Design a protein around this ligand. Structure first.
Ligand SMILES: O=C(O)CCC(=O)C(=O)O
Ligand SMILES: [Mn+2]
Length: 321
């Protein structure tokens, strides 16, 4: 298409890394015109409960916004060293299992899909195709119907309570105290994958914010207007980065035109080199990651991005209509 968004989506899909092509992409980790401050409520989440999600204390968090996009909040990586591996491990291993609908279910059964993890262990032994490599989305909580474009009181699997915990802290720190993680879409990217221009319009309550977690390889994110004519702003999303779309930003058109290969070759971003600590807190929502688990996760994220996206579908007591 020739309308501003599709033009730019096209440009960044076909962008060449390590050239002048990415000059206009904002990097929140490292421009100065558009990027602005954003206060987080620091006393909201305790130093102990941030510890339980694998997060730094909220006091340590950098948090930015954008000129022209009120309500858009961008953390950088808050996560403690190593703790990104638990969340990446859940998204591949636990969350994709059934119950809890993945994209492989349209043309396979519970027979074929049930040993996605064990198969990908077997790909470790075969040094020098797979189910994990075909996985593109998983839903949790209220399952989004891609065809109907609706949620339903019928189609739901209890939200993962550890992910619901991480969600609540991130929500509260951004000034969203009574946030209920009711619905989850997870997205899995190869280096050639893209997510098309869309608006996350089919939750019923548009007060409540949209949480967008990111892990592994970097991606470009286009955030645009209320209609697709308007040209978007490009920004990088790095491993561990978090994105709230709240207020005016909630119902904005956005996309991911590109996932990017590591600049220094193949291999992981530097932040993911640190492993999970052996000593984990007594009361934690994070669970020890085995040696084999880390190895599958590690080899996958060398050429993949995983995104988690946590939403509230119904107002605090808007029983399903
Ligand atoms: O992968 C991303 O960061 C985009 C996720 C998203 O917009 C969605 O799934 O609604
Ligand atoms: Mn979206």
């Amino acid at each position: 298409g020739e309308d501003a968004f599709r033009k730019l989506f096209r440009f960044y899909r076909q962008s060449r890394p390590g050239t002048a092509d990415l000059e206009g992409v904002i990097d929140f980790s490292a421009g100065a015109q558009k990027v602005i401050k954003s206060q987080l409520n620091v006393s909201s989440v305790s130093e102990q409960n941030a510890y339980r999600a694998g997060l730094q204390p909220v006091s340590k968090w950098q948090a930015y916004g954008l000129k022209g996009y009120p309500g858009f909040i961008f953390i950088p990586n808050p996560f403690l060293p190593g703790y990104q591996w638990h969340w990446v491990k859940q998204c591949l291993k636990l969350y994709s299992q059934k119950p809890n609908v993945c994209n492989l279910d349209k043309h396979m059964s519970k027979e074929e899909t049930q040993d996605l993890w064990e198969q990908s262990k077997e790909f470790l032994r075969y040094k020098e195709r797979s189910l994990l490599e075909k996985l593109r989305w998983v839903t949790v909580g209220y399952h989004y119907n891609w065809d109907s474009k609706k949620y339903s009181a019928d189609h739901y699997t209890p939200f993962p309570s550890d992910l619901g915990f991480l969600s609540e802290q991130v929500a509260a720190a951004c000034g969203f105290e009574d946030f209920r993680a009711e619905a989850g879409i997870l997205n899995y990217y190869r280096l050639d994958s893209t997510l098309g221009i869309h608006v996350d319009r089919s939750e019923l309550d548009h007060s409540k914010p949209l949480l967008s977690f990111s892990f592994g390889q970097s991606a470009i994110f286009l955030l645009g207007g209320l209609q697709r004519d308007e040209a978007p702003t490009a920004m990088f999303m790095h491993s561990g980065d978090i994105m709230i779309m709240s207020g005016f930003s909630r119902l904005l058109n956005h996309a991911v035109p590109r996932v990017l290969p590591n600049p220094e070759g193949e291999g992981l971003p530097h932040c993911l080199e640190a492993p999970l600590p052996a000593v984990l807190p007594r009361d934690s929502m994070v669970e020890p990651c085995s040696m084999e688990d880390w190895q599958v996760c590690a080899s996958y994220l060398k050429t993949a991005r995983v995104n988690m996206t946590v939403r509230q579908v119904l107002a605090t007591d808007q029983n399903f209509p």
